[PDB]
Amino acid sequence: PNVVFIKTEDPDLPAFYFDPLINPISHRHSVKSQEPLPDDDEEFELPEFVEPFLKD
Amino acid sequence: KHAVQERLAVTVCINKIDRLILELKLPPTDAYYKLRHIVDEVNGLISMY
Amino acid sequence: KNSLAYQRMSWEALKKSINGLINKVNISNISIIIQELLQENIVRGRGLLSRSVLQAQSASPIFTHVYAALVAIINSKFPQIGELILKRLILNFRKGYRRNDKQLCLTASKFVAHLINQNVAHEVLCLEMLTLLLERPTDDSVEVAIGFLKECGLKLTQVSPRGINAIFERLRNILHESEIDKRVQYMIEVMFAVRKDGFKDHPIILEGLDLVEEDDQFTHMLPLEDDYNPEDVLNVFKMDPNFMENEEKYKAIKKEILTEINLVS
C-alpha cells in the first residue's frame, strides 16, 4: 500500500496542516443523510467534571 | 454488493487510523470530513444494491 | 451665452466621444484607447467616466477585463476615478445581491474580481464579498462566490492564501454538511477543480491587463457594507464659473501625465 508522507517546506505551519499537496476533499453526494438523531429538548446534560480528554 | 445479494448482516470497521494522523497530517475537521465521506459513499452504495 | 453654449457643447460631444472610446477600447489598443481617453479630459467628466466604465463592465461579461485595464491605467494615475468606479460596483453588487438580482450581482462582482486581480481592489473587501456570498449559500450565492472565484481565486490566494484555505473550509462544510443539490455539489467540485488546477484556466490578468509597475499602482480599499456612495450624479453636467481656471489646470495635468568536407567524410 503506497505510503504518502508529505514533506514540509518550512518548520512554521502546524504539524497537522492541510497543504495544497493533498487533493481538496470536496466529498459530494445526494441529500447527504439524516440519522436516528436524538434531538435535545427532551434532555441531556454533562456533569461538569469531565472537560475534553486532554485539552490542556 | 455480494453481501447484499446474499442478505447478511452488514458490519464496517474503518481501520488504520494513524494513516490520517502521522501519515496524512490532516487537521481534525477535514479528518472528520474524510471519515464522513467514506461513510456516505459506502452507505449510498449499499443504497444502490 | 457663449461660455454656456461652450460648456454644453463640451459636455455633449465630450461624453459621446468618451463613451465611444469606452466601448472601443481594445487590448491591441489598450494604451492607445487610454491615451485617447486622456487626450479628452476624462476627469472633467469623471462621473460619466466612471459611468462608461461601469456600463462596460456590467453589460459585458467578456469586456470586464478590458474596462478593468482602462480602470487600472486611469487609477494608478487618478485613483479617485477607479475609486468612484469601485464604490459604484460595490453599490451594484449589493444591489444585485440584497435585491436578489443574480445578473446585477454577477456583473458587479465580475467588475470587482477584475479590480482585485488588477490590484486596484483590496483583499479585505473581497473577503467580505466571499463571506457575505457564502454565509447562507443557496444555488445563487454559491454560484456568485464561485463565479467571483473563477477569476479572483488567484489574486486572493497569492496575496493571502489564508483566504483560499478559508474559502475551501467554508465551501466544503456549507456544501458537505448541509442540504444542497447537484447544483452546489458540482459547483464546489468546480471550485476544487480550479484550486487543484492551480488557477491555470484563469490567472490574475491576461497579457496587457497589468503593465503598471510594482508600487506605481493604487489599490484603494472601500469595502462592501461600509456606507459608500455612487457619487454618480456627476453623470449629469454642471455649469462652470471656474471653467477656464480648472480647464488650464486639468489640461496641464493631462500634459504632465501623458570544402564539401562533410560530403567527403
Q: From residue C202, how far is each of A33, C84, C109, C117, C167 by CA, in Å?
A: 35, 26, 16, 10, 17
Q: How far apart are CA C113 and CA C122, in angstroms?
A: 10
- Tell me whether residue B18 is annotated as binding: yes
Please, what's the b/e burial string for C249-258 (b: 16 or more CB within 10 A of its CB; e: otherwise)? Answer: ebeeebeeee
Residues near C213 by beta carbon (within 8 Å), at least 6 away in sequence = none
Place of cell 518548520: A11
Q: Is C121 helix (H, G, I), strand (E, B) or coil?
A: strand
C116 burial type by CB count under 10 A (0-12 exposed, 13-18 middle, 19+ buried): buried
Interchain CB distance below 8 Å, A23 and C186 = no
HSE-up of residue C21 (Cα within 13 Å, Cβ side): 22
C261 burial type by CB count under 10 A (0-12 exposed, 13-18 middle, 19+ buried): exposed
- Tell me the torsion sign for CA atoms C124, C130, C132, C135: negative
Name the percent of chain C in helix, strand, coil, to the closest 5: 70, 0, 30
The answer to whether the beta carbons of residues C130 and C171 sit under 8 Å apart is no
Question: How long is chain A?
Answer: 56
Min distance A12 CA to chain B CA atoms (Å): 14
Q: From residue C179, how far is each of A33, A34, C173, C206 by CA, in Å?
A: 9, 10, 11, 37
Which amino acid appears at position B32 of this protein? Answer: Y
Q: Which of C161, C153, C73, C67 is nearest to C108 (CA)?
A: C67
- Tell me whether residue B16 is annotated as binding: yes
* Residues 10-39 in A contacting C (C-alpha not used; CB under 8 Å): 18, 20, 23-29, 31-32
Q: Which of B14, C193, C177 is nearest to A32 (CA)?
A: C177
Q: How far apart are CA C147 and CA C136, in angstroms?
A: 16
- Tell me the torsion sign for CA atoms C186, C187, C188, C194: positive
Provide the angle, in degrees to the nearest 10, between the axes of the packed helices C123-134 and C79-98: 10
Residues of C in contact with B33 (CB under 8 A): 172-173, 176
- Tell me whether residue B1 is annotated as binding: no
Which amino acid appears at position B39 of this protein? Answer: V
Please indicate the experimental technique that yielded this structure: cryo-EM
Residues near C252 by beta carbon (within 8 Å), at least 6 away in sequence = none
Min distance B38 CA to chain C CA atoms (Å): 13
Min distance A5 CA to chain B CA atoms (Å): 5
- Tell me whether residue B17 is annotated as binding: yes
Q: How far apart are CA C145 and CA C141, in angstroms?
A: 6
What's the distance, Cα to Cα, between the start and end of chain C in Å? 94
Torsion of CA C29, C34, C37, C39, to 10 degrees: -100
What's the distance, Cα to Cα, between the start and end of chain B in Å? 6
Q: What's the grid cell of residue C222?
A: 472601500
The answer to whether the beta carbons of residues C210 and C72 sit under 8 Å apart is yes
Q: Which chains touch A (3 or more CB pairs under 8 A)?
A: B, C
Question: Which residue in chain A has the smallest CA separation from B32?
Answer: A25
- The residue among C167, C170, C173, C174 with the most chain B CBs within 10 A of its CB, best to mutate, is C173
Min distance C198 CA to chain B CA atoms (Å): 21
- Resolution in angstroms, to 1 decimal, for this deposition? 4.2
* Residue B26 main-chain phi, psi, to 5 deg: -105, 115
Q: Is C250 helix (H, G, I), strand (E, B) or coil?
A: helix
Bridge partners of residue C37, in order along the sequence: none
Interchain CB distance below 8 Å, A14 and B34 = no
DSSP class per residue in C194-232: HHHTTT-SS-S--TTS--S-SSSS--B---SSS------
- Decide if C136 touches B, using CB distance below 8 A: no
C241-247 long-range CB contacts below 8 Å, 24 or more apart? Answer: C243/C3, C243/C6, C243/C7, C246/C44, C247/C41, C247/C44
Size of interface B-C (CB pairs under 8 A): 10
DSSP class per residue in C156-201: HHHH-HHHHHHHHHHHHHHHHSS---HHHHHHHHHHHHHHHTTT-S
The answer to whether the beta carbons of residues C145 and C97 sit under 8 Å apart is no
Q: How distant is the alpha carbon of residue C193 from its chain centre? A: 24
